[PDB]
Design an enzyme around this catalytic site. Sequence first.
Site, PDB file in Angstrom:
ATOM      1  NE  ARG A 280      -6.082 -11.918   5.517  1.00  0.00           N
ATOM      2  CZ  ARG A 280      -6.771 -11.187   5.930  1.00  0.00           C
ATOM      3  NH1 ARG A 280      -7.720 -11.696   6.930  1.00  0.00           N
ATOM      4  NH2 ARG A 280      -7.509  -9.982   5.517  1.00  0.00           N
TER       5      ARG A 280
ATOM      6  CE1 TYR B 276      -8.359  -1.810  -0.849  1.00  0.00           C
ATOM      7  CE2 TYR B 276      -9.133  -3.682   0.302  1.00  0.00           C
ATOM      8  CZ  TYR B 276      -8.029  -2.970   0.025  1.00  0.00           C
ATOM      9  OH  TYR B 276      -6.958  -3.208   0.751  1.00  0.00           O
TER      10      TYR B 276
ATOM     11  CE1 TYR C 140     -13.458  -0.564   4.489  1.00  0.00           C
ATOM     12  CE2 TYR C 140     -14.811  -0.660   6.336  1.00  0.00           C
ATOM     13  CZ  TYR C 140     -14.099  -1.242   5.374  1.00  0.00           C
ATOM     14  OH  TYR C 140     -14.597  -2.654   5.238  1.00  0.00           O
TER      15      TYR C 140
ATOM     16  CG  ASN D 231      -3.775  -1.933   6.526  1.00  0.00           C
ATOM     17  OD1 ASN D 231      -3.581  -1.726   5.464  1.00  0.00           O
ATOM     18  ND2 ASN D 231      -5.014  -2.325   7.149  1.00  0.00           N
TER      19      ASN D 231
ATOM     20  CD  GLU E 228      -8.125 -10.077  -3.139  1.00  0.00           C
ATOM     21  OE1 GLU E 228      -6.895 -10.344  -2.909  1.00  0.00           O
ATOM     22  OE2 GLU E 228      -9.079  -9.945  -2.440  1.00  0.00           O
TER      23      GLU E 228
ATOM     24  NE  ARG F 282      -2.789  -5.324   7.295  1.00  0.00           N
ATOM     25  CZ  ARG F 282      -3.977  -5.547   7.027  1.00  0.00           C
ATOM     26  NH1 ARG F 282      -4.828  -6.018   7.794  1.00  0.00           N
ATOM     27  NH2 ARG F 282      -4.138  -5.517   5.524  1.00  0.00           N
TER      28      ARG F 282
ATOM     29  CE  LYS G  79      -3.972  -2.455   2.097  1.00  0.00           C
ATOM     30  NZ  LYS G  79      -4.943  -2.428   3.205  1.00  0.00           N
TER      31      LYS G  79
ATOM     32  CG  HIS H  86      -5.070  -7.074  -0.090  1.00  0.00           C
ATOM     33  ND1 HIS H  86      -6.410  -7.181   0.673  1.00  0.00           N
ATOM     34  CD2 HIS H  86      -5.062  -7.799  -0.918  1.00  0.00           C
ATOM     35  CE1 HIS H  86      -6.927  -8.050  -0.020  1.00  0.00           C
ATOM     36  NE2 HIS H  86      -6.136  -8.730  -0.916  1.00  0.00           N
TER      37      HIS H  86
HETATM   38  O1  LIG Z   1     -12.471   0.780   9.343  1.00  0.00           O
HETATM   39  C1  LIG Z   1     -11.687   0.308   8.412  1.00  0.00           C
HETATM   40  C2  LIG Z   1     -11.701  -0.845   8.001  1.00  0.00           C
HETATM   41  C3  LIG Z   1     -10.667  -1.350   6.865  1.00  0.00           C
HETATM   42  N1  LIG Z   1     -10.095  -0.365   6.387  1.00  0.00           N
HETATM   43  C4  LIG Z   1      -9.206  -0.651   4.998  1.00  0.00           C
HETATM   44  O2  LIG Z   1      -9.967  -1.284   4.325  1.00  0.00           O
HETATM   45  C5  LIG Z   1      -9.137  -2.830   4.244  1.00  0.00           C
HETATM   46  C6  LIG Z   1     -10.030  -3.864   4.342  1.00  0.00           C
HETATM   47  O3  LIG Z   1     -10.658  -4.082   5.536  1.00  0.00           O
HETATM   48  P1  LIG Z   1     -10.403  -5.253   6.518  1.00  0.00           P
HETATM   49  O4  LIG Z   1     -11.224  -5.156   7.755  1.00  0.00           O
HETATM   50  O5  LIG Z   1     -10.919  -6.324   5.737  1.00  0.00           O
HETATM   51  O6  LIG Z   1      -8.975  -5.320   6.565  1.00  0.00           O
HETATM   52  P2  LIG Z   1      -8.028  -6.471   6.186  1.00  0.00           P
HETATM   53  O7  LIG Z   1      -8.816  -7.584   5.402  1.00  0.00           O
HETATM   54  O8  LIG Z   1      -7.143  -6.017   5.111  1.00  0.00           O
HETATM   55  O9  LIG Z   1      -7.013  -7.146   7.201  1.00  0.00           O
HETATM   56  C7  LIG Z   1      -8.262  -2.596   5.449  1.00  0.00           C
HETATM   57  O10 LIG Z   1      -6.907  -3.189   5.089  1.00  0.00           O
HETATM   58  C8  LIG Z   1      -7.963  -1.160   5.651  1.00  0.00           C
HETATM   59  O11 LIG Z   1      -6.776  -0.615   4.837  1.00  0.00           O
HETATM   60  C9  LIG Z   1     -10.314   1.202   6.659  1.00  0.00           C
HETATM   61  O12 LIG Z   1      -9.794   1.991   6.140  1.00  0.00           O
HETATM   62  N2  LIG Z   1     -10.802   1.668   7.664  1.00  0.00           N
HETATM   63 MG   LIG Z   2     -10.656  -8.930   4.487  1.00  0.00          MG
END
Ligand SMILES: O=c1ccn([C@@H]2O[C@H](COP(=O)(O)OP(=O)(O)O)[C@@H](O)[C@H]2O)c(=O)[nH]1
Ligand SMILES: [Mg+2]
Lengths: 133, 132, 132, 132, 133, 132
Positions: free
Chosen positions: E88, E52, E60, E111, E125, E101, E11, E114
């Site tokens: 993961r 996404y 968000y 963060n 993806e 992370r 990212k 992905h």
């Molecule tokens: O409150 C939130 C939740 C998620 N995200 C973004 O959207 C992505 C997907 O959300 P998820 O909760 O699935 O996180 P991840 O799967 O990447 O661990 C995250 O990596 C964050 O960068 C965000 O900006 N605000």
């Molecule tokens: Mg997810």
Amino acid sequence: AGLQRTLVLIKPDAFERSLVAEIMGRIEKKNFKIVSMKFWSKAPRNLIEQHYKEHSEQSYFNDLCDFMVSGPIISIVYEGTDAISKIRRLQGNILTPGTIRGDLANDIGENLIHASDSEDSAVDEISIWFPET
Amino acid sequence: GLQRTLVLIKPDAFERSLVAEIMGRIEKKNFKIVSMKFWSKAPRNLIEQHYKEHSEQSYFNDLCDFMVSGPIISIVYEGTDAISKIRRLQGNILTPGTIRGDLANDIGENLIHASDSEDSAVDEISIWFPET
Amino acid sequence: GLQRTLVLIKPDAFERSLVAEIMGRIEKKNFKIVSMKFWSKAPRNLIEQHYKEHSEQSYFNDLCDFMVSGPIISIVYEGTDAISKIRRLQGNILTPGTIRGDLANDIGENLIHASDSEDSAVDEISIWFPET
Amino acid sequence: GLQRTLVLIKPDAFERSLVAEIMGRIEKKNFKIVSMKFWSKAPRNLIEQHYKEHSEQSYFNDLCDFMVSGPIISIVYEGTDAISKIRRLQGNILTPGTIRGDLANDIGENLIHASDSEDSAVDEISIWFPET
Amino acid sequence: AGLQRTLVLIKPDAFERSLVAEIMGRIEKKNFKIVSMKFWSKAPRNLIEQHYKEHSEQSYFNDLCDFMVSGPIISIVYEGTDAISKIRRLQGNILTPGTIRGDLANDIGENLIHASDSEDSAVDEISIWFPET
Amino acid sequence: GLQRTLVLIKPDAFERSLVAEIMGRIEKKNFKIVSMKFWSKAPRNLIEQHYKEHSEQSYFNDLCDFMVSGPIISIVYEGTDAISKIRRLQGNILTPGTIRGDLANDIGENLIHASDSEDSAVDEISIWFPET
Ligand SMILES: O=c1ccn([C@@H]2O[C@H](COP(=O)(O)OP(=O)(O)O)[C@@H](O)[C@H]2O)c(=O)[nH]1
Ligand SMILES: [Mg+2]
Ligand SMILES: O=c1ccn([C@@H]2O[C@H](COP(=O)(O)OP(=O)(O)O)[C@@H](O)[C@H]2O)c(=O)[nH]1
Ligand SMILES: O=c1ccn([C@@H]2O[C@H](COP(=O)(O)OP(=O)(O)O)[C@@H](O)[C@H]2O)c(=O)[nH]1
Ligand SMILES: O=c1ccn([C@@H]2O[C@H](COP(=O)(O)OP(=O)(O)O)[C@@H](O)[C@H]2O)c(=O)[nH]1
Ligand SMILES: O=c1ccn([C@@H]2O[C@H](COP(=O)(O)OP(=O)(O)O)[C@@H](O)[C@H]2O)c(=O)[nH]1
Ligand SMILES: O=c1ccn([C@@H]2O[C@H](COP(=O)(O)OP(=O)(O)O)[C@@H](O)[C@H]2O)c(=O)[nH]1
Ligand SMILES: [Mg+2]
Ligand SMILES: [Mg+2]
Ligand SMILES: [Mg+2]
Ligand SMILES: [Mg+2]
Ligand SMILES: [Mg+2]
């Protein structure tokens, strides 16, 4: 021994780039000890101007001072055998890999660290940063 | 250009927990351990043979005491141009980028020994690894 | 709570140049090498004793071949709660932060062995370091 | 001022898992990726173009077979004095502190290519990134 | 084997913080191989919105897309045994030290990385980022 | 949102040379130093204040003698969810991936202190940084 003290400044670009621990660790790994240390969220311009007084008539003097007050700095007295020149060699220059500047910096101004370059500058610089001598 | 060279890891490396750090720099340069011994305390005789070239120097006796003041590792390393390359890796306490350069700050306590020639290498390997 | 535990560094660590990296994680946790052996190729018998508990499992024979497919280091480590702590350090290929967790990705080629109990530790130390 | 330069990560970096290590050193010196491509296998005419000043040398075919023996990454990097600073970072196998000095030990398998001049830079960038 | 492929994005905060090699190296050290990789100085908003799409009705979503186009990103297909879940677990979360992370990030949005979270998301993806399938 | 928290680097970090290592981990998670002091020897009443919830415990005097046995650094760090995130980074000696998990192996000599709550934070910051 050949036991000396020298003065190190961590410059604002180090905090900006998150290289603070990286720089201190290189000095730590060569077996030098912190003897005194101060954190300045912003250093007094007068301290900087003194510190760089030998440069007061260079073109770069004003931008240097500007930069040196543009973020935090840490001043550190280090101790160890031959500390002044050994820590100076650690600082190195932007052209020399292996050294702090050689590995991490790429600019004549923003170069992460100051180290004292002689017994004379060390005594004088320690005086400036740690007047409580 | 295949060569073998003898390395000692000195007691100060154990004192300061730099053993892996030192062996790591040699490993990452692509040299291979061919044999290896750990000594909780090296036999004084072994140290005297090892530094015999030095038996006249003023530092000799302090040097032997220090070499016996804690553990050492004796390592036979192999690779292209090994003797000279591991010597450069060892370096000196002045020039950063090397083992001593980065990690040591004493003329005596300097973490590592590496053979400096073909003759010294054969000799030193036979002192520590006599089963050849 | 002082303990000794036996560690093997497996051939895959040599293949991938992770030897120092692995010993380093144990060194930085403050455990001390008490004895150490390097084997260019471990005697098959030694490996069979070491994994005897496993002689019936389907993976046994592949496991022995792999253990002999390159160098290994046998290390006796000492420290407070060593057996259990070095086991945690070893970890598993699932959980990051550990040796396997960070560096390994196979159920067979997983870089390190660490004794898992007081009994296994005594036994394994006697297999590799019989002079006690 | 700013320059751009062309870097190749050679197939030996992939094999020895040093890709992130090499890129990391360039990254920590504050150079920025402007362009980057991964080639699971680079087309041979590209490699021959890249090394065309070398076409009459005895190692030419062997170099090209090597360069095609696994993946490469081509990268255009940008920063102050990029061509020359990245060249120094690359160093050579006799110079500890550099990429080749710490990590390489062969005249041919030496991990990284870096443009050596303004002209070779502009040329090499057009070879790997002809879109521009 | 249990040989899989998964999709990783680096990212824009990683480039901003100079953590790119640091993140890729952790994945490299666990013995995963790059199979394809693309560098995007700026990624097409449509690619991000697709990527996404499952989040298209979250609060968000718009700031996420804004951020994802705010700097460079690298898309990478990795290969290895059990690659999807292992990478993961490497990603982990901002609460868990040991992971990318956990060690390097401190924000629910910015963060660093992905990783695909199932065989289904991986196939989909990979399709998005490398249509040349 | 942002919180501030108080960290102490304990005397064992100085002795084992882990000061930069510990600070580096907090630095890489994006926390910022707001205030910092180096104490070659911290005054004992400060230490006793800091540990006042511990005054009735059996280890209290021993903890304080330890905390006074070498240098400490007191730091106020700032960042999102600082108190709790820095606590998790500190971890414990059974949890690989954390500061105590990778680097410490004693109930008492465990390298780092981190405030454990909003209230202990505000209190500990006023102990070490009474100017405010
Ligand atoms: O409150 C939130 C939740 C998620 N995200 C973004 O959207 C992505 C997907 O959300 P998820 O909760 O699935 O996180 P991840 O799967 O990447 O661990 C995250 O990596 C964050 O960068 C965000 O900006 N605000
Ligand atoms: Mg997810
Ligand atoms: O052209 C210049 C020369 C130097 N400096 C700054 O002033 C300091 C002192 O200059 P010097 O050449 O003595 O560098 P140093 O002694 O720190 O290596 C340097 O660290 C730079 O940060 C600068 O901004 N521009
Ligand atoms: O003044 C000295 C010089 C040498 N040494 C020790 O003796 C070793 C061999 O001396 P030499 O000058 O050959 O050092 P080297 O070849 O290892 O650099 C050094 O590594 C030191 O540990 C010492 O204790 N005092
Ligand atoms: O399916 C398996 C399980 C075990 N092993 C090997 O056998 C060793 C011992 O098995 P165990 O389940 O006790 O693993 P450990 O205790 O070392 O985690 C492992 O480290 C592997 O190298 C294997 O090759 N295949
Ligand atoms: O005897 C040789 C000389 C060079 N090369 C390869 O050809 C490249 C270009 O040669 P040069 O001497 O110009 O190396 P460089 O400029 O990259 O340092 C080197 O990097 C090596 O990978 C080789 O394979 N054999
Ligand atoms: O039996 C003990 C328990 C704790 N402590 C010390 O006292 C501190 C505070 O104890 P606590 O259990 O609250 O540890 P923490 O909250 O820091 O994890 C610890 O960090 C140790 O340094 C000790 O010396 N002996
Ligand atoms: Mg100067
Ligand atoms: Mg000599
Ligand atoms: Mg078991
Ligand atoms: Mg050339
Ligand atoms: Mg507590």
